[PDB]
Design a protein around this ligand. Structure first.
Ligand code: F9F
Ligand code: F9F
Ligand code: 0JO
Ligand code: 0JO
Ligand code: NH4
Ligand code: NH4
Lengths: 395, 265, 395, 265
């Protein structure tokens, strides 16, 4: 029994060991109560404004659309405290944790932005924070490891499986199944068991709300499409949510194509996997013929995940949102292009969304279109990775 | 069939609890796994709980994680597991056999087909670890359709509604969780639950998680449980003796015999 | 002859080779014209808002003032695009450069934040950017070197002298003296020859303007003091300017004490040097008995400078502002404390200002005081430096 | 005194331009520097421009930067420079001696005291490189008070007001900058300026920056300049021959003699 629907069509649910169901029901109740509590909403709003820096800018690109009929705006979640959108919903979940009498926080992280967010919120609000991170990601997103530890978080490298995000997720959940009495699992994406896909959407939906207000102010109309990268799905559902009932607005989610879908080395289960049950949810996943979960791949740690949040699988199924993929090389070119022509260094995750917008423009340059890309994070964490690549290519 | 029903009735007569080892099918290889299982049975195992190797076993600690990894290193697939199960049942007609499954392996190419396969090889029960009673309808329906007992979990934090559901939906045995957390002999883990389950006419309770010693088996029986499950303690003996398959079986026999002896009241 | 006063009392002036005086007079004229041009002001305002993310938050500390009668706010220039206050005036000077028909930009940088700002503004506004950086700073502020180069700026290591900020300044000025016909020298601090101290103040003064509005909104009164670190002087004069005529508001500038003033290894010429002429200005400097310019020292590259902007020397002389120093170890403790108790990683420069505020609180914990620290930048550039130190100490 | 006035009058009679070498005092050491300077004079130098080593010489390129560094490595101080200047004047009573100074070295312990010291050792002019005419009042006042010629710069971008100021404020000679930028033989660098300076009765013009060859000296004279200054070209000969002090002086003599020969019309 739940207060809210755990499913989005066929997708979602609460596929966790029985031991964790009371924790999930407690969290759901706490969320529903908080959502109608004016004091909770005021505290959350105050942190978002005065601590995190909301609202974030909506930046019109000045150069990269030259000679085309595309107008491109960037929603600047890269300017949020911590450097990514992940900070929004962590502030909300941390307040929920306090509301529920929890003193510790467990989090998983891939790009380390959710890890950084979990650590900074725990430091601010007086919680003891431990973060699981795949050992491969500890290396390729190292600046965030340093940032997490300087803020007093325990960072635990995960060497099992692919040593990336799915393996951090596994260990976080294993931990919680034993520590839920005192620890809140601050899941960092719009995936996992109910109520997390719902909570994460509601605590990220100010992205799209602000975007709508800002684009109406600057252009006097809604966008033709909003475009966001999709790992687990939080920045995209945060951008999409307030536009779902605006049927004229395209919702475009961009999964990582890795080395190419045909290589099998990608992270695009929504469009190239099939439905399975894993990480507490029924959702599209990369899996073997036998039903073993496949390891994903992306140049971007934040998108290196073999499943996807259930609300995206649903929005796809009914045709409300469209999902595409972008390869490592396409993302790298978008990264370089934004750096050199707009003076913004984007996260490699966000670069996948930008790459697809650039394709929409370049493929049809006389098509009139007003586009918004969710620039979900800044690229400081990626600069050493990207430089090393742009040295094995000359450059 | 009625293999669990027949087992518990016999144990009841003999004033005995059940001792039920867990191992991963195909750990450390198919042939040695089959020998291990025959040894477990010869040493006094009343029933078996057998894991099908899964890529991401979220209810298991490192010991059984590494059992899964060993089986995969031997190339073990669910298909090969079902071949093993058929062979085991061919040798041992009455021992109850329960599988430890993760949901995706059951769901993968059809829930109904999975339970149909279980029936064909002579499996008696299936415990899907990441499917709570709330999500269980198509699993327990398919299970009952193919004469498989669906197993459900009574955690220490169980409320009355869960107790009533577990008692109603479950067959064969009720899993009485010793503690929160994941499987592991390192972490050792209630009469009010045992009594309430009996009041609601639930399947007999087997206590599991963290049971690694004969004293814990005796204590579970004394508490009113119908028996006890031990996994990681068994698997550690396998892990310890990989280079010594002969000592592996000797130490397994010694341990299982000692655990079974403690179930006798 | 000039349009504006080049002096602040005895301090300031235009002590450059004769060859550069027309360039300085041109720049002054361009600035005076721009300051009364509604279109220039609108373009500058639009970039500050929609590209850089102004206004920046004013954050009340929740934990580090516990048990005292100090209320401490942080002006969050760390949330500005680029990660430091340096971005504000670079956007203004870049617009000035365009106004003057220049196609290239020269800049110096120490912490690399002005370098990053110069590079991002040049990429946005279509200018070719070269940046001088001391070789010691190339190493200890390496993340910003990567950021500058990814945005297409040329970064030129300077090995002469101390291989730090003063040496980058020297080379930038040498370059400009030959390239002024086509290059604008985008000086990055409130120092150097007139009109730069004035221009930099006016293009940074929104820091204090916003702070005043924000503190009035939240507290209904002006601060008892505003506190800012002082290298060349730009973030401090930017915070101070709008409060200069509010005589009740203390203005406290914090120079780097390095290993301790008594060691001679510091960057605190305002209070521990004597007046000299160098880098185009008459100002306090660290100098030998003979009048050779001394090399400075600070753990912070951005404060490692042996002089100070002339308006600070003036405000000190008349007693309007007070200047103090903070050692490496005091700055490191403030850095750690902000990370762990407020979840904000500050620049090591900014940590000097925070350290002094913490001293004001700790020394007199029952003194009622409302303080604002200018958190001039974020500490991502410093995390590898700080970690290496906090390993040679155990920790 | 009137050493520049006397020099230019004599050169005028002989139909000659001045050739004026620059070196850094104390480069590569005090004793060798004194020998270098005697060699410059014996080889035909009409006047001298001499730099006092300064920590941050912002109008100088790498060649003279490294001359300053060499002198500092020899421990050369302004005090030692003034001792050198006294010795030079003791040996050479009529040659005009001009100093190349940076402002802080003049300002350091009193502008008036600096120019008083110059007078005491027999210096004839001081060029403060980073003090434009706009900032020059206390410098030129102190200079004239102590019978020192203050030297000012006529850049290629000079307007009429600058020309009139330079003509009025300056004594001894007017510095005619060949080009923008900083000192350097690598970078080679106007009649309208030369003519206007003469119209306003300015001190005779010496062209400087980038002059490294006899052809450039001849060309400056042909243009109507009273002579030419060469620094980096001279200093490169010092730098090249550090391990060979004897060849250093021979090559200096050859070069200075060739440059001076080209000044003769
Ligand atoms: O002795 P231990 O600690 O290794 O425990 C062995 C248990 N092996 S098992 O198949 O019964 C078993 C039973 C239930 C499990 O998860 C669930 F409770 F969530 F369903 C996992 C394994
Ligand atoms: O031959 P080069 O290129 O080395 O030039 C040598 C010049 N040496 S100097 O003392 O006359 C000299 C004269 C003026 C200088 O700067 C100023 F113009 F700004 F004042 C610097 C050096
Ligand atoms: C995996 C992580 N980050 C993902 C991420 C993503 C992808 O995650 P979502 O699909 O949940 O937005 C997008 N943009 C940025 C800047 C990100 O850091 C993490 O920081 O833990
Ligand atoms: C030297 C540099 N930075 C100085 C700096 C300073 C000191 O410079 P001002 O005194 O000009 O504010 C303060 N805070 C931050 C974040 C800084 O980066 C530079 O980035 O070039
Ligand atoms: N995905
Ligand atoms: N300073």
């Amino acid at each position: 029994t739940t207060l809210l629907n755990p499913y989005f069509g066929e997708f979602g649910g609460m596929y966790v060991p029985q031991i964790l169901m009371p924790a999930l029901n407690q969290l759901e109740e706490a969320f529903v109560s908080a959502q109608k509590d004016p004091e909770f909403q005021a505290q959350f709003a105050d942190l978002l404004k005065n601590y995190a820096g909301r609202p974030t800018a909506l930046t019109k690109c000045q150069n990269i659309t030259a000679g085309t009929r595309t107008t491109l705006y960037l929603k600047r979640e890269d300017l949020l405290h911590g450097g990514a959108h992940k900070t929004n919903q962590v502030l909300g979940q941390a307040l929920l944790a306090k509301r529920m009498g929890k003193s510790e926080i467990i989090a998983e992280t891939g790009a380390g932005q959710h890890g950084v967010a979990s650590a900074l919120a725990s430091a601010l609000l007086g919680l003891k924070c431990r973060i699981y991170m795949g050992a491969k990601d500890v290396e390729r997103q190292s600046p965030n490891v340093f940032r997490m530890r300087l803020m007093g978080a325990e960072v635990i490298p995960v060497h099992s499986g692919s040593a990336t995000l799915k393996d951090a997720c596994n260990e976080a959940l294993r931990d919680w199944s034993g520590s839920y009495e005192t620890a809140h699992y601050m899941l960092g994406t719009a995936a996992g068991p109910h109520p997390y896909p719902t909570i994460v959407r509601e605590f990220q939906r100010m992205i799209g709300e602000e975007t709508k207000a800002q684009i109406l102010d600057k252009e006097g109309r809604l966008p033709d499409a909003v475009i966001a990268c999709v790992g687990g799905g939080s920045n995209a559902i945060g951008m999409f949510a307030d536009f779902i009932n605006d049927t004229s607005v395209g919702l475009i989610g961009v999964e990582p194509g890795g080395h190419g879908i045909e290589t099998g080395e990608h992270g695009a289960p929504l469009k190239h996997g099939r439905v399975g049950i894993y990480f507490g949810m029924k959702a599209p996943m990369m899996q073997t013929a036998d039903g073993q979960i496949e390891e994903s791949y992306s140049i971007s740690a934040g998108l290196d995940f073999p499943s996807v949040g259930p609300q995206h699988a649903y929005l796809n199924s009914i045709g409300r949102a469209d999902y595409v993929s972008i390869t490592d090389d396409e993302a790298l070119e978008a990264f370089k292009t934004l750096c050199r022509h707009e003076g913004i260094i984007p996260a490699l995750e966000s670069s996948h969304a930008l790459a697809h917008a650039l394709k929409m423009m370049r493929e049809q340059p006389e098509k009139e279109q007003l586009l918004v890309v969710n620039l979900s994070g800044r690229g400081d964490k990626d600069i050493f990775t990207v430089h090393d690549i742009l040295k094995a290519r000359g450059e | 069939m009625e293999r669990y029903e027949n087992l518990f009735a016999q144990l009841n007569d003999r004033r005995e609890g059940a001792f039920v080892p867990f191992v991963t099918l195909g750990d450390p290889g198919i042939e040695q796994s089959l020998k291990i299982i025959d040894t477990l049975i010869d040493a006094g195992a009343d029933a078996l709980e057998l894991g099908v190797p899964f890529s991401d076993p979220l209810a298991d600690g490192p010991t059984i994680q590494n059992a899964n990894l060993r089986a995969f290193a031997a190339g073990v697939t669910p298909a090969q597991c079902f071949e093993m199960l058929a062979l085991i049942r061919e040798k041992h007609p009455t021992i109850p056999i329960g599988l430890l499954m993760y949901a995706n392996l059951v769901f993968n190419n059809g829930i109904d087909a999975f339970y149909a396969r279980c029936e064909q090889v002579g499996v008696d029960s299936v415990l899907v670890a990441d499917v709570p009673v709330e999500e269980s309808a198509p699993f327990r329906q398919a299970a009952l359709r193919h004469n498989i007992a669906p197993i459900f979990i009574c955690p220490p934090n169980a409320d009355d509604d869960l107790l009533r559901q577990v008692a109603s939906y479950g067959r064969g045995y009720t899993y009485l969780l010793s503690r929160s957390g994941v499987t592991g002999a390192e972490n050792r883990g209630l009469h009010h639950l045992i009594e309430k389950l009996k009041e609601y006419h639930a399947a007999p309770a087997l206590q599991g998680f963290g049971i690694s010693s004969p004293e814990q088996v005796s204590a579970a029986v004394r508490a009113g449980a119908a028996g006890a499950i031990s996994g990681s303690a068994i698997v550690k003996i396998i892990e310890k003796n990989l280079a010594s398959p002969k000592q592996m079986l000797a130490e397994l026999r010694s341990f299982v015999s000692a655990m079974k002896a403690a179930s006798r009241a």
